[PDB]
Amino acid sequence: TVAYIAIGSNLASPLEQVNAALKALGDIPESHILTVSSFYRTPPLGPQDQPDYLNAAVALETSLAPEELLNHTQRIELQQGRVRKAERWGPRTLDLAIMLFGNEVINTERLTVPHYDMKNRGFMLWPLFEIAPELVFPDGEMLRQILHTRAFDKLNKW
Template identity: 55%
Template sequence: MIQVFIGLGSNLAKPLQQLKVAVDALGSLPDSRLLKVSSFYSSQPMGPQDQPDYVNSVALIETQLLPDVLLDHTQAIENEQGRQRKGERWGPRTLDLDILLYGSQTINTERLIVPHYGMQQREFVLYPMFEIAPNLILPNDKTLDDLISITPKNGLHKIQLSTDL
């Protein structure tokens, strides 16, 4: 089994509910097991600012699925939750699932780049990931602790959840 970190994000169509449904779907992946999920965080959008704030989280799973097969499954989850791929980078979306790390592997194919190309600069990835894996060392030998120490929160904050999402 390989440990895989998956970033979750949504800013449309009840984002908290989108992430909750996505976490449940990740827990139902074949040949996989959901190990941990960070708190949900509110973050400012990366790209165009004329969109709602995002809700983000990071999940840790163990899987026997190959990277491309896992990507097929995460994209199917996005599609089931109304994701429309418009080619607009950093635009609003119902659900975004990113494979951040796939064990300690480096993957660079037309469909998938792992470690995720922007994760080391993104507070909405680093802080939730640090919450569930504070001692993690990335494939480039950088520690999450070191990255957190140089990455400002930019307004990122935990969302206090009620029990009835």
């Protein structure tokens, strides 16, 4: 199954964080990277007392169960010093979001796929569109037509 993973970092040298994340993603068992996007510098969504993000997307072929993939992405976050605090939408060294897991629809306590807010976020959709221009969501919507509808600001390279 092809999983699409969003990468974000705005602490502790985001370029190094994203490169480390890509290396680690490729080392996940029973999985391999298919495609990687460019790196983008994006202004923060949410609180404004935090640095700009590096955002990117990856396509990962995997035979892991989705929750097992999640276990691995969370391990990578922790390896790269991810902490969590009370604030929502706050800064982080590394975040990995499972945007899609094939065409699956998953609604569980630990895991919601497609990612619950991605259709509202240019910083998730644009890097995804770079690597999967033909992508269709489980609900039948085309990524290309969502981007044209919402007309989110285009991104700048990191």
